Design a protein around this ligand. Structure first.
Ligand SMILES: N#Cc1ccccc1-n1ccnc1
Length: 209
């Protein structure tokens, strides 16, 4: 049972700007997703201080980076707080509306796409390098869901029948044909060292078989 939704016009406009604008410094997508993971880990850690049972779904707080050349995917996995169905369908897009408008205004005033995270909509920089994004997520208060979009104005949400995650989020980047450098170990190491060196959680870069 797959549900198809329309993006709000403003978010669809943001996605088209990310896809269509000429902008060579694409590597910042990884910093933006890792920053999102770190924020989600901060949240579950803070909540667990006053309710230890929130970690019954997993005590480990970490980030895994998993390249797969066979699938041409880069997956960013965290064990953070995860997202609810309402987050996926409405809450996060609602918040992103104001950040998008401010980001668009800043771009016309001289900012560049690398500053997208200062407006709270860094997730959408995934479309700098990905033709399709699949997000698997599990929040303590909700079921496991798969969100997916190839842009074009729509996204889908379904209950995920796959391997249970416990708690957290998996962002699966189906990379564009000319963006496979982000599957190379040395390239990912370089980018993590450059932009994510002080993240307060272990980042494990998986090796390919
Ligand atoms: N990750 C993520 C995500 C997935 C679906 C919709 C919105 C999302 N999002 C936007 C900003 N932070 C998170």
């Amino acid at each position: 049972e797959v549900e198809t939704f329309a993006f709000q016009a403003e978010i669809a406009q943001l996605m088209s700007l990310i896809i269509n604008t000429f902008y060579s410094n694409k590597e910042i997508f990884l910093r933006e997703l890792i920053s999102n993971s770190s924020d989600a880990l901060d949240k579950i850690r803070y909540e667990s201080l006053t309710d230890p049972s929130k970690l019954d779904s997993g005590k480990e707080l970490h980030i895994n980076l998993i390249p797969n050349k066979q699938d041409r995917t880069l997956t960013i996995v965290d064990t953070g707080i995860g997202m609810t169905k309402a987050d996926l369908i409405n809450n996060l897009g609602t918040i992103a509306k104001s950040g998008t408008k401010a980001f668009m205004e800043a771009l016309q005033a001289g900012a560049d796409i690398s500053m997208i995270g200062q407006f709270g909509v860094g997730f959408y920089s995934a479309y700098l390098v990905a033709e399709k994004v699949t997000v698997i997520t599990k929040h303590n208060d909700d079921e496991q869901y798969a969100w997916e979009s190839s842009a074009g104005g729509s996204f889908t949400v379904r209950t995920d029948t796959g391997e249970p995650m416990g708690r957290g989020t998996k962002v699966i980047l189906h990379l564009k044909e000319d963006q496979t450098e982000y599957l190379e170990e040395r390239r990912i190491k370089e980018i993590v060292k450059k932009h994510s060196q002080f993240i307060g959680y272990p980042i494990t870069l998986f090796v390919e078989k």
